[PDB]
Ligand binder design. Structure first.
Ligand code: PVN
Length: 165
């Protein structure tokens, strides 16, 4: 017994909705969202997860590509970014304006690459208060993101190869 629905589980969103599901439990934060950079430098709305009391940010499509200047390369090397508060970052520039609405008081990012390529990044925002990430929590969370590459690598290839069939 495992519910036919479970066996028929093959939705691309399922595998994605899961990662974030664990992230919340793993990081033990208050809010978490998944975003990637498609061929438009736009934060792809992979999956959005917001704890009770907070609205769904999925209604907000990351307009800021951040592609400008150096940045993508930062993750291309597996750089770790931990900002207790994006408020003390890039002042006098576009940030709080687009970050205030989401009520994101904490910003944590971890690089996720596939076959030496940039796919996306997992972010965890605490809407209740800014928390200092734990050395172990960062590594564990980074592992969760790296895992997605394992699946994507298989599907991304198999899915594409299938069409070439
Ligand atoms: C303002 C939007 C802007 C313009 C215009 C521009 O040309 N550059 C600058 C973009 C920018 N933003 C940061 C800092 C951060 N970026 C992220 C990641 C995101 N971009 C998004 O659109 C979203 C969706 C919510 C995210 C999550 C984050 C988390 C930060 C802050 C944390 C940190 O890195 O400390 C920068 C970096 C500043 C620099 O120039 O070095 C730039 C250029």
């Amino acid at each position: 017994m495992a519910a036919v629905q479970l066996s028929e589980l093959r939705d691309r969103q399922a595998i994605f909705e899961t990662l974030v599901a664990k992230g919340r439990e793993l990081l033990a934060c208050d809010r978490v969202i998944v975003y990637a950079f498609d061929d438009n430098y736009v934060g792809t709305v992979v999956a959005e997860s917001v704890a009770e009391g907070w609205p769904q940010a999925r209604d907000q499509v990351i307009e800021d590509p951040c592609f400008r200047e150096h940045w993508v390369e930062a993750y291309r090397q597996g750089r770790i970014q931990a900002t207790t508060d994006i408020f003390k970052a890039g002042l006098t520039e576009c940030h709080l304006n687009q970050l205030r609405p989401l009520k994101v008081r904490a910003n944590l990012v971890v690089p996720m690459v596939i076959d030496d390529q940039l796919f996306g990044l997992l972010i965890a925002h605490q809407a209740s208060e800014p928390r200092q990430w734990q050395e172990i929590e960062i590594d564990q969370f980074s592992e969760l993101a790296s895992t997605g590459s394992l699946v994507l690598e298989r599907l991304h290839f198999l899915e594409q190869t299938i069409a070439s069939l």
